[PDB]
Design a protein around this ligand. Structure first.
Ligand SMILES: Nc1ncnc2c1ncn2[C@@H]1O[C@H](COP(=O)(O)OP(=O)(O)OP(=O)(O)O)[C@@H](O)[C@H]1O
Ligand SMILES: Nc1ncnc2c1ncn2[C@@H]1O[C@H](COP(=O)(O)OP(=O)(O)OP(=O)(O)O)[C@@H](O)[C@H]1O
Ligand SMILES: [Mg+2]
Lengths: 592, 120, 120
């Protein structure tokens, strides 16, 4: 590019030496000025006519002179900002000089150069301040004009989508003054946990303006950054991915035996979904997933299609790591030799093949692992629990693989008949082998059951646990042991109800959970039934938990990484990749 | 495959079932007992096949510390899933060990124990 | 008093917390362990003060005679009141002892244990 930007004042002949500043010749020079009659563009035009290959652009701030008023000052600042935005190279930083002009415009332009990047900002000083062109020519022949620069200024790597969102606006005035960044500048320091909660140490290298940008509260209009945000999902159910629509249709279309498909029943529609205006129960929430599940997933081709579609959705949502909860027994069928082990092996090999084929082409691949759900009183006899644990440990014993079995899961209906203090003796062996347990101790479960899950089952995670705020001792031990607490915003909002739900008074406790120090993680539960993936799940926190900050979201991602059951080396590689990606996304996020 | 091949020829054939042993390695890799038990439990569930797994075994280094009241924490589900348990005791152990193996592990069979006569 | 004196002058200070060591005797007056646990619980119940009680040390002769399969029912009490427990199983011990010290005593921190290399 090689574009100059300069301010023209009384000393109008400072541009030629700025052009001569480069030691190899220059390409295009652009000058900004006010509407005062002092400036004489004729001299500069005649000087630059000797180099017709150089694009001379002269712009004058209409209806402004002497910048003597605060209103005049802000008018000049906004026109100068717009001109800088509309007069910069697309993908290289330009060269800028500011020796022309009084302190006001000079300081404003220097701050703008810091604020939008500049390849090199410098100053031109002349001992005698030449007026005629031959005088400054003779001065440069000896070397009187010296060159003063403070160094290369990277600026911010990405801020220029202001010029896309804001058009040329050739017809405008002081009325449509844009204070887009000034309130961000005002809230830089006007507003300990938010100070040193900094995860991903490379965020320190990140320039300060975007740091304070992260310190701002979350808003609904950050959906683009949320989607570009690399995320982690740990509480994901395979049986609730596709429930209706084109996804369900194309999952049905790939089944081995079409005649065994009920292509008639569809779930009942709920107005406003996923933003439910009326509270719902667990029974209706599960009935919404009746069209899918074990009743339709028996077909092997249907299973492969569902797994591939779920993995594709995970990759699309920019999720860089996930863990899937699956129920092998539900999809087993002894009629076609479809044992539970066979179903689990099919899922494992499909995921491994998908991950390997995505990694071979060097694209973005979502590393995924499986969780074996061990339900309570779901199919009859409780020996199914022992069967599930035995299958899970035998599967983990495979030894070599990419998509492995991290651990088991403990899920039940509400309480009592599905309490978490019944199967310690059964769990001894499986927990001794080296798996992990994520008890669903929550959703209107008394604190005693959560205590048993934490201290007798050695559960490393707790599902939901929304009402943990009323057990100070249980809280204290949870934070003291950093036990992960998976929470599903949309699912719990739909099935329980939280502000701003109509006719509701209770509010979501996630903000207090984060302030206390619980290793909270945000998940999706059932994508199809709730109708919301991880991106909108995180986005809804702005209107669910007011005052939530962006650094809080980054700490949520960090906690999700922390509580996942992975080896140390894999955790280190994942952390490095996540930190680099996080730095890139926050570099290119303040652009918009 | 061998059983089906012999049966197709209509010649006399020998039906064979498999028992998964649980070696009493004692101190070494204490998780091996649980791994073997779970392997047997999930392997008997393949269903299809003339040959199958019908039970587990408790053979290994027999000792007073290795008595039936030492691994009894891990057998709460072997009978739950419908397996069968044998045992190897009495060659050098105590009749109390045989008694608990009969009554704690619910061992349907028993190995050796040539000194039963001394305990009417 | 020392911490407050150092802090009030705006100088570098060393925050210090005490751990009550449940001394191992295993010979006489075995109620001393329960007395130590009760003393530690009441001491942590003070609440106020920059310096407080945060944990109990299970030190002493870490041999097999005093492993972690003795007083876990008693340590239920200390775990209930949100008090940390530090174990000590690092000299002349078997991997089994470290294992149920971690999983029954619920030792949130472990002492020594120099021979973890041989127990993957
Ligand atoms: N459970 C079994 N175990 C072993 N062999 C069996 C079994 N069931 C059927 N058979 C086979 O059925 C076949 C019936 O044979 P059959 O009654 O005609 O007597 P055979 O041919 O004269 O003499 P043989 O019994 O030796 O074949 C037997 O050969 C036998 O091997
Ligand atoms: N938790 C803490 N532990 C130890 N010292 C602390 C703690 N909190 C505050 N301080 C003290 O706060 C003081 C702040 O000092 P300051 O930020 O002005 O740097 P300094 O005086 O130039 O050098 P120094 O940190 O050694 O005092 C420190 O001296 C530090 O000892
Ligand atoms: Mg769930």
């Amino acid at each position: 590019s090689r574009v100059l930007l300069c301010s023209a004042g009384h000393s109008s002949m400072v541009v030629p030496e700025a052009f001569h500043a480069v030691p190899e010749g220059f390409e295009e020079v652009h000058v900004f000025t006010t509407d005062s009659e002092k400036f004489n563009p004729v001299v500069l035009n005649d000087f630059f006519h000797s180099l017709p290959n150089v694009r001379f652009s002269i712009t004058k701030c209409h209806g402004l002179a002497d910048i003597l008023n605060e209103r005049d000052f802000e008018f000049y600042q906004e026109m100068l900002w717009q001109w800088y935005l509309t007069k910069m190279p697309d993908n290289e930083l330009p060269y800028v000089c500011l020796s022309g002009g009084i302190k006001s415009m000079s300081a404003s332009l220097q701050k703008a150069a810091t604020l939008f990047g500049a390849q090199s900002v410098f100053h031109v000083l002349a001992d005698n301040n030449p007026r005629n062109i031959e005088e400054m020519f003779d001065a440069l022949q000896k070397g009187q004009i010296h060159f003063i620069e403070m160094g290369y200024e990277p600026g911010w790597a990405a801020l220029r989508r202001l010029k896309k969102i804001l058009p040329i606006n050739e017809g405008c005035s002081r009325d449509n003054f844009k204070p887009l960044i000034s309130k961000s500048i005002e809230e830089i320091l006007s507003n300990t946990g938010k100070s040193n909660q900094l995860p991903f140490p490379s965020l320190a290298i990140l320039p300060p303006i975007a740091q304070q940008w992260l310190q701002l509260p979350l808003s609904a209009n950050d959906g683009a950054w949320i989607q570009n945000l690399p995320k982690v999902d740990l509480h994901c159910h395979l049986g609730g991915f596709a429930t209706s629509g084109s996804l369900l249709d194309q999952v049905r279309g790939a089944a081995s035996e079409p005649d065994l498909i009920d292509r008639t029943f569809s779930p009942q529609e709920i107005a406003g979904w996923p933003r439910s205006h009326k509270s719902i129960s667990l029974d209706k929430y599960m009935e919404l997933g009746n069209a899918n599940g074990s009743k339709l997933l028996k077909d092997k081709g249907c299973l492969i299609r569902q797994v591939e579609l779920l993995y594709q959705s995970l990759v699309n949502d920019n999720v860089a790591y996930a863990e899937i909860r699956c129920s092998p027994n539900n999809y087993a069928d002894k009629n076609k030799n479809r044992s539970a082990w066979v179903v689990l092996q099919d899922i494992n090999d499909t995921f491994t093949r998908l991950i390997t084929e995505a990694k071979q082409k060097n694209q973005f691949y979502c590393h995924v692992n499986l969780l074996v759900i061990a339900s309570r009183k779901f199919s009859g006899d409780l020996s199914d629990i022992s069967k599930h644990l035995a299958l899970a440990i035998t599967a983990m014993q495979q030894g070599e693989g990419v998509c492995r079995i991290v651990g088991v899961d403990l899920a039940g209906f509400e309480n009592k008949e599905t309490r978490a203090s019944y199967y310690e003796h059964d769990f001894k062996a499986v927990h001794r082998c080296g798996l992990a347990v994520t008890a669903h101790a929550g959703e209107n479960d008394d604190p005693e059951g959560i205590w048993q899950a934490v201290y007798s089952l050695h559960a490393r995670r707790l599902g939901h646990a929304l009402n943990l705020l009323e057990a100070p001792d249980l809280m204290r031990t949870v934070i003291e042991r950093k036990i992960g607490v998976e929470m599903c915003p949309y699912a719990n909002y739909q099935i329980k109800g939280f502000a701003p739900m109509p006719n509701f008074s209770a509010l979501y406790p996630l903000k207090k959970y984060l302030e206390a120090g619980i290793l909270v993680s945000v998940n999706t539960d059932n994508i199809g039934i709730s109708g919301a993936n991880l991106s909108e799940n995180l986005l809804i926190l702005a209107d669910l938990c007011p005052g939530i900050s962006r650094m809080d979201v980054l700490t949520i991602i960090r906690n999700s990484i922390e509580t996942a059951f992975i080896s140390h080396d894999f955790r280190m590689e994942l952390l490095k990749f996540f930190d680099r990606k996080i730095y890139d996304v926050c570099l290119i996020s303040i652009k918009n």
